Amino acid sequence: MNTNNIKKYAPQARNDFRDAVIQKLTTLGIAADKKGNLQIAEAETIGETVRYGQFDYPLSTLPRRERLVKRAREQGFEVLVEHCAYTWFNRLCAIRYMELHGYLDHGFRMLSHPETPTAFEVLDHVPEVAEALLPESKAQLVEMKLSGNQDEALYRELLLGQCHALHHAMPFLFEAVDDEAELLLPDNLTRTDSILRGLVDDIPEEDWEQVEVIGWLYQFYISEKKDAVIGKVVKSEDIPAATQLFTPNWIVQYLVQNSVGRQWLQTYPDSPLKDKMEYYIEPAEQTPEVQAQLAAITPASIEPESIKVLDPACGSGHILTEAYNVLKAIYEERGYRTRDIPQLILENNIFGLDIDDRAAQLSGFAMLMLARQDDRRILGRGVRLNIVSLQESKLDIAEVWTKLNFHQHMQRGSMGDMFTQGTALANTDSAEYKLLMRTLALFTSAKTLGSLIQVPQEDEAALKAFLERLYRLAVEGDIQQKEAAAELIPYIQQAWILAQRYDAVVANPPYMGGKGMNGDLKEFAKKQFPDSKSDLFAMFMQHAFSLLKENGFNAQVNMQSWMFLSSYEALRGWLLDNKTFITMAHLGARAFGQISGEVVQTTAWVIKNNHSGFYKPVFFRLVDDNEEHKKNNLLNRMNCFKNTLQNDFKKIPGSPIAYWATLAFINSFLKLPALGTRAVKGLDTNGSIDVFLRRWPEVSINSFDALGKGNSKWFPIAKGGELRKWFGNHEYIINYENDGIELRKNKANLRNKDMYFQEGGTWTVVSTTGFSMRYMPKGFLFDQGGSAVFCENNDELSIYNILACMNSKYINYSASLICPTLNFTTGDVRKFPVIKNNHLEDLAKKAIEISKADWNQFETSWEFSKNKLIEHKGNVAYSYASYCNFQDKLYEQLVNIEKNINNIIEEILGFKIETTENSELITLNSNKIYRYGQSETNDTFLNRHRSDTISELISYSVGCQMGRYSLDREGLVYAHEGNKGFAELAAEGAYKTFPADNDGILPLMDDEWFEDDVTSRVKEFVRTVWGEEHLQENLEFIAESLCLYAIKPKKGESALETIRRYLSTQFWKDHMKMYKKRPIYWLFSSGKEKAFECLVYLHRYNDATLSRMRTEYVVPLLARYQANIDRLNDQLDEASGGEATRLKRERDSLIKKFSELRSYDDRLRHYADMRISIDLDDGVKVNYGKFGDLLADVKAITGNAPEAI
């Protein structure tokens, strides 16, 4: 495996070389501070010796360092360090690869010795290698060999000579002479501490058998640094630092073989080439008109030396390798001389641009090695490549021109250009040359932009001629002319390369969103690409067509976001008006092996250049598989689709590419009215979420508009919610008094104000499972996340009809197809289809009635009437069975109604549709599946359901005891602040059947000392509701139900002990969970020990509550505890032995509780000193922290640890 050897060594070594570079800088008086300011020491010249502080060197090296000084100021310090580091790394890797494969003339290892670790073959053949490299001074080297010492110097000299020899064959990688990096070459190569030994014996040689390993370097040597430049804003320097990957071979072969091979086969269908190309795609059938039109432009014959392949982003160059393979196959088929084939291919068949010098060097080396593998006589001819990297333009305008002395050699020295000197074309004009100035002016910020700079085609041919002249000046001119030509070559070369027109383009554009783009890049994108400015690859794809000529091709692999999203929507339209698809493979996630994360969802597509809307493309579906399975399925031609016309994509609104979609569905989409613009967007508040939004049960009924009359301070407001059908989620209240004067002060957004308080349908803007719409009566306000629907004053579309249509399977499927991201903005909803009928109205009415009846059986709804179990007088089990039967009947009725609606819609449309996830889910609390989620098996939710029912019964009984509920009348009894009016209700006899506590304080202890014990009142309530004869069996049943799932059953106890334990242990958690951390019953606990705990109703509370509670409870409890302690102490002397022991220990705990109680009393004393009065409108979360530690779980509610007095 590659990662076993190449990885775990490539990244670390990247830093190591850099360190050596720093060392060299320290030896040359070159340094930078923390801020990066230049700290270059001043050279001292004494005795032809240069000194930089302490270090010294011979005078001959002085001028070279001066160039480095320029390198210090022309660019960044770290830039130069990294440049030298990767240059040396690439050179060493290339030398190792060449020596291992034995392509050298002499055929001797340099970095190691065969069958002898830590040695050198050249040391055994010094005269031969010296003659091969340096015949002129070999004898002196032999003297060094005669010396036996200075082995390091001899090795360094041999390495430098080998590099100089290798310069000629690869001018783009090795320098001939006067290389500054020679001074930067690390010393002590012969010593074991040198990194050369690690490079030699850190990777097995068996990995050096294929070119593939080279590519891995391009993905590893920077990978570590990628981790430091990922997820942040990216500058120009770091543009390649986080957008370098590797591509699997099969994808590249699919891209290449279906672009050039198809063009070749169209001209010559009878050729023995399709057999070799395994990934070629057989075109589908076409109409005779399409065939006639296509055959009208197919060329009769194409010269082999006329095909152009261009790569805007080469990197490793494996795409170029595949192209070279295909072109070699074509040339061999034609019948040229075999060994002549490679060089010709490298002449006018490959072109590559990149933005990193390292990538260009790697690509050149890879191509040269691939060519060498087959041709033996390569490297003996000066073959010049065309894989280059862009260069910035900062040079003297005319000084280089003056040094050119063009008129002296041929012509055009002073004023002669391609045009006249004073032509003044565009803005560059011609101080010395027209074309030169025009070309140079367009590369001012080339490093910032890249391959996106456009060049006019008309200037192509002339440029070519100009290039030739420079080629005649590098060898047949004076020193000044040669250096000027060398300086000016790259700019003209890259301009001419960009100025051509090509046939096939293959590339893998880098991925970078809006965040990565800097200000300059973003403003350039906005200026140049209005329709694709969202992301880089969109601009890349749009611009790639600018270089293709007629009958071109574009093959690319990129993210699938442009397929559906509306941001690229216009782009999609522009594709469907002038282009013509050929093929597309949707890979989705789980592709790009050796890469963590499934966010990468990519597709590979091949698109023609001309326009023909009646062609039939070929698609594929390879989403749900692993890499090997995807490759096998593509090999086996799995999941094909050839039943779609290109023009049909323009009928679906939004123009989304949906290949797997049927045809009848698309046709039926058109002949149906749309929803129109009835949908509106809800209002929004700036930052007042916690200022006006509250839960309904925590405010006064008078302050509630829905419950109260006359004055209005609060209003319900729907907002979000989970999946829910036809009714629910009315659990948020907002403050809108005096037409939102406070909101207008807050400057909150207000939209469609005049249409408020109107009945209609509402849907959730941001969902996670699907789409659903719910009814809403009048007197409501809708949030921005609660965009609503309102029918016109006089139109045939009723709200019930729309609600019936929306929740059908057809609408859900269409919505899923349109927006696969589960996001529902107003605009997309505005273009939904809608049907018209009459039975749908009554069916929707019945569904709404059933849903509302289901929702009106819980305390969380203000429309609560009464508990279900108290309507049956037979028995507890009988009432439970009746309740279960009622829920089952509701479920069955809803299921039948949904089935009938679906059947009616399907028969109206006339074609069946598929079923998907959550297509038949029932959103009722009666359904155990929806209420309790999904488990491994059914039948588990019986004991839990019974326990929850009994818990609800106990909670209702507690609420009745508190006075909130009364059995005399239905609905809410008293929910007003300050307990005011309680005496009037007592006089009215609202609690006639069941007395209500006068002080609104519920003690909770383990003894029956208090006459108002919760347990005793519960027993009285049960005996009143269900009589006295069957009291014991009912209590046993309730205890069993509680022991089922609520708490672990105890070994031996009666019903009363179980009830008391459940109340003292589990009740608070259940209440908090039910009311979602906004409790209405406040618990005051003396401590963790059950010394004293009481419950208080929030509404009935007032200032006098605290002192009255303290006086009426703590002092009598203190007296009782003191008397019990005195009695126990008196009896302790009477008792003896173990009988006394159990009497003593508990006593301690008791007095411990007593002590704790005293402490609580002290705390109470503090709050007995001050009088506290609060308001509901302040906020329960706000007010809960006003009592210090008198409450429990204060951090859970208030969100922070409470203070202490």
Side-chain angles (χ1 to χ4, degrees), residues 43 178 289 354 403 453 465 477 631 670 779 787 816 827 867 907 1097 1120 1198:
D178 203 341
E289 300 78 8
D354 202 310
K403 296 175 55 58
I453 310 178
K631 178 181 298 182
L670 175 60
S787 301
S816 62
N867 181 270
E907 70 88 12
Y1097 198 10
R1120 177 187 181 272
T1198 57

mmCIF file of all heavy atoms in Angstrom, residues 43 178 289 354 403 453 465 477 631 670 779 787 816 827 867 907 1097 1120 1198:
data_model
loop_
_atom_site.group_PDB
_atom_site.id
_atom_site.type_symbol
_atom_site.label_atom_id
_atom_site.label_comp_id
_atom_site.label_asym_id
_atom_site.label_seq_id
_atom_site.Cartn_x
_atom_site.Cartn_y
_atom_site.Cartn_z
ATOM 1 N N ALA A 43 27.470 42.709 3.960
ATOM 2 C CA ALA A 43 28.675 41.968 3.617
ATOM 3 C C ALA A 43 29.920 42.819 3.834
ATOM 4 O O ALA A 43 29.939 44.015 3.531
ATOM 5 C CB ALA A 43 28.609 41.499 2.166
ATOM 6 N N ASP A 178 25.703 28.755 -12.532
ATOM 7 C CA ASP A 178 25.362 29.903 -11.690
ATOM 8 C C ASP A 178 24.019 29.694 -10.990
ATOM 9 O O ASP A 178 23.141 30.560 -10.999
ATOM 10 C CB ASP A 178 25.363 31.200 -12.504
ATOM 11 C CG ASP A 178 25.561 32.432 -11.642
ATOM 12 O OD1 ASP A 178 25.345 32.349 -10.415
ATOM 13 O OD2 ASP A 178 25.936 33.488 -12.195
ATOM 14 N N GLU A 289 -34.241 13.176 -38.618
ATOM 15 C CA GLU A 289 -33.839 14.573 -38.748
ATOM 16 C C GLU A 289 -32.551 14.847 -37.983
ATOM 17 O O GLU A 289 -31.650 15.528 -38.488
ATOM 18 C CB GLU A 289 -34.958 15.493 -38.259
ATOM 19 C CG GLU A 289 -36.270 15.355 -39.020
ATOM 20 C CD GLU A 289 -37.071 14.135 -38.604
ATOM 21 O OE1 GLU A 289 -36.685 13.476 -37.615
ATOM 22 O OE2 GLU A 289 -38.084 13.832 -39.268
ATOM 23 N N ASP A 354 -0.763 25.587 -15.586
ATOM 24 C CA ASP A 354 -0.958 25.446 -14.152
ATOM 25 C C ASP A 354 -0.574 26.753 -13.477
ATOM 26 O O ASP A 354 -0.122 27.703 -14.121
ATOM 27 C CB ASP A 354 -0.154 24.270 -13.586
ATOM 28 C CG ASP A 354 -0.714 23.758 -12.271
ATOM 29 O OD1 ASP A 354 -0.949 24.580 -11.360
ATOM 30 O OD2 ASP A 354 -0.932 22.534 -12.154
ATOM 31 N N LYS A 403 17.862 46.508 -24.967
ATOM 32 C CA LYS A 403 18.853 45.440 -24.993
ATOM 33 C C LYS A 403 18.586 44.434 -26.104
ATOM 34 O O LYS A 403 19.515 43.739 -26.530
ATOM 35 C CB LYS A 403 18.891 44.725 -23.643
ATOM 36 C CG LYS A 403 19.355 45.599 -22.490
ATOM 37 C CD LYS A 403 19.242 44.864 -21.165
ATOM 38 C CE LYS A 403 19.996 43.546 -21.200
ATOM 39 N NZ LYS A 403 21.439 43.738 -21.513
ATOM 40 N N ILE A 453 -8.061 34.482 -17.683
ATOM 41 C CA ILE A 453 -7.799 35.672 -18.484
ATOM 42 C C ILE A 453 -8.085 35.360 -19.945
ATOM 43 O O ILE A 453 -7.582 34.371 -20.493
ATOM 44 C CB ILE A 453 -6.354 36.152 -18.289
ATOM 45 C CG1 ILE A 453 -6.030 36.257 -16.799
ATOM 46 C CG2 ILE A 453 -6.141 37.492 -18.973
ATOM 47 C CD1 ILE A 453 -4.611 36.676 -16.518
ATOM 48 N N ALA A 465 4.639 33.661 -34.887
ATOM 49 C CA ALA A 465 5.813 34.107 -35.628
ATOM 50 C C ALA A 465 6.806 34.783 -34.695
ATOM 51 O O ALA A 465 8.005 34.471 -34.711
ATOM 52 C CB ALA A 465 5.397 35.051 -36.755
ATOM 53 N N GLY A 477 22.455 35.107 -31.046
ATOM 54 C CA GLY A 477 22.527 36.513 -30.709
ATOM 55 C C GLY A 477 23.611 36.748 -29.681
ATOM 56 O O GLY A 477 24.237 35.811 -29.179
ATOM 57 N N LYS A 631 -17.484 1.027 -9.909
ATOM 58 C CA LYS A 631 -16.702 0.679 -11.091
ATOM 59 C C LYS A 631 -17.277 -0.547 -11.788
ATOM 60 O O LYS A 631 -17.376 -0.581 -13.020
ATOM 61 C CB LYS A 631 -15.241 0.445 -10.711
ATOM 62 C CG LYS A 631 -14.363 0.039 -11.883
ATOM 63 C CD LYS A 631 -12.929 -0.202 -11.448
ATOM 64 C CE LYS A 631 -12.308 1.061 -10.881
ATOM 65 N NZ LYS A 631 -10.888 0.849 -10.493
ATOM 66 N N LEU A 670 -47.678 20.042 -16.934
ATOM 67 C CA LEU A 670 -48.010 21.263 -17.664
ATOM 68 C C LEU A 670 -49.502 21.570 -17.600
ATOM 69 O O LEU A 670 -49.901 22.703 -17.307
ATOM 70 C CB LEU A 670 -47.552 21.140 -19.117
ATOM 71 C CG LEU A 670 -47.948 22.291 -20.041
ATOM 72 C CD1 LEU A 670 -47.365 23.606 -19.543
ATOM 73 C CD2 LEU A 670 -47.504 22.006 -21.467
ATOM 74 N N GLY A 779 -57.555 35.049 13.710
ATOM 75 C CA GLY A 779 -56.922 35.537 14.919
ATOM 76 C C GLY A 779 -55.546 34.948 15.150
ATOM 77 O O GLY A 779 -55.226 34.522 16.263
ATOM 78 N N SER A 787 -44.617 30.832 6.737
ATOM 79 C CA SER A 787 -45.274 31.405 5.567
ATOM 80 C C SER A 787 -46.623 30.742 5.327
ATOM 81 O O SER A 787 -46.737 29.514 5.341
ATOM 82 C CB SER A 787 -44.381 31.246 4.337
ATOM 83 O OG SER A 787 -43.132 31.885 4.528
ATOM 84 N N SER A 816 -40.462 16.970 -3.301
ATOM 85 C CA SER A 816 -39.178 16.318 -3.077
ATOM 86 C C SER A 816 -38.303 16.399 -4.319
ATOM 87 O O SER A 816 -37.094 16.640 -4.223
ATOM 88 C CB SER A 816 -39.393 14.861 -2.670
ATOM 89 O OG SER A 816 -40.054 14.139 -3.695
ATOM 90 N N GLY A 827 -40.924 31.444 -2.983
ATOM 91 C CA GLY A 827 -40.975 31.441 -4.438
ATOM 92 C C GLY A 827 -41.224 30.062 -5.018
ATOM 93 O O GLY A 827 -42.036 29.902 -5.933
ATOM 94 N N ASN A 867 -60.458 15.103 31.383
ATOM 95 C CA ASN A 867 -59.750 13.847 31.190
ATOM 96 C C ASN A 867 -60.695 12.770 30.667
ATOM 97 O O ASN A 867 -61.895 12.770 30.953
ATOM 98 C CB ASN A 867 -59.105 13.389 32.498
ATOM 99 C CG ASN A 867 -58.329 12.097 32.341
ATOM 100 O OD1 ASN A 867 -58.877 11.007 32.508
ATOM 101 N ND2 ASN A 867 -57.050 12.211 32.008
ATOM 102 N N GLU A 907 -56.826 8.420 -9.417
ATOM 103 C CA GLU A 907 -57.734 8.158 -10.528
ATOM 104 C C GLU A 907 -58.001 9.419 -11.339
ATOM 105 O O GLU A 907 -58.240 9.332 -12.550
ATOM 106 C CB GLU A 907 -59.041 7.543 -10.018
ATOM 107 C CG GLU A 907 -59.941 8.475 -9.223
ATOM 108 C CD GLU A 907 -60.899 9.260 -10.100
ATOM 109 O OE1 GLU A 907 -61.029 8.920 -11.294
ATOM 110 O OE2 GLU A 907 -61.517 10.221 -9.595
ATOM 111 N N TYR A 1097 -48.425 26.933 43.651
ATOM 112 C CA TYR A 1097 -48.973 27.372 42.374
ATOM 113 C C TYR A 1097 -48.452 28.768 42.049
ATOM 114 O O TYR A 1097 -48.427 29.649 42.913
ATOM 115 C CB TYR A 1097 -50.500 27.370 42.432
ATOM 116 C CG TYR A 1097 -51.182 27.378 41.082
ATOM 117 C CD1 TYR A 1097 -50.458 27.173 39.915
ATOM 118 C CD2 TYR A 1097 -52.549 27.592 40.976
ATOM 119 C CE1 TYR A 1097 -51.076 27.181 38.683
ATOM 120 C CE2 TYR A 1097 -53.176 27.602 39.747
ATOM 121 C CZ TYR A 1097 -52.435 27.395 38.604
ATOM 122 O OH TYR A 1097 -53.055 27.403 37.378
ATOM 123 N N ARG A 1120 -42.518 19.578 66.286
ATOM 124 C CA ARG A 1120 -42.730 18.138 66.195
ATOM 125 C C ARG A 1120 -41.406 17.387 66.159
ATOM 126 O O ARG A 1120 -41.246 16.363 66.833
ATOM 127 C CB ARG A 1120 -43.565 17.808 64.959
ATOM 128 C CG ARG A 1120 -43.776 16.319 64.741
ATOM 129 C CD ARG A 1120 -44.460 16.047 63.413
ATOM 130 N NE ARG A 1120 -44.686 14.622 63.203
ATOM 131 C CZ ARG A 1120 -43.808 13.799 62.649
ATOM 132 N NH1 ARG A 1120 -42.628 14.225 62.229
ATOM 133 N NH2 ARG A 1120 -44.121 12.512 62.513
ATOM 134 N N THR A 1198 -33.055 28.330 34.761
ATOM 135 C CA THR A 1198 -32.502 29.644 34.454
ATOM 136 C C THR A 1198 -31.309 29.573 33.510
ATOM 137 O O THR A 1198 -30.923 30.603 32.946
ATOM 138 C CB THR A 1198 -32.094 30.358 35.744
ATOM 139 O OG1 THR A 1198 -31.158 29.547 36.465
ATOM 140 C CG2 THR A 1198 -33.313 30.618 36.617
#
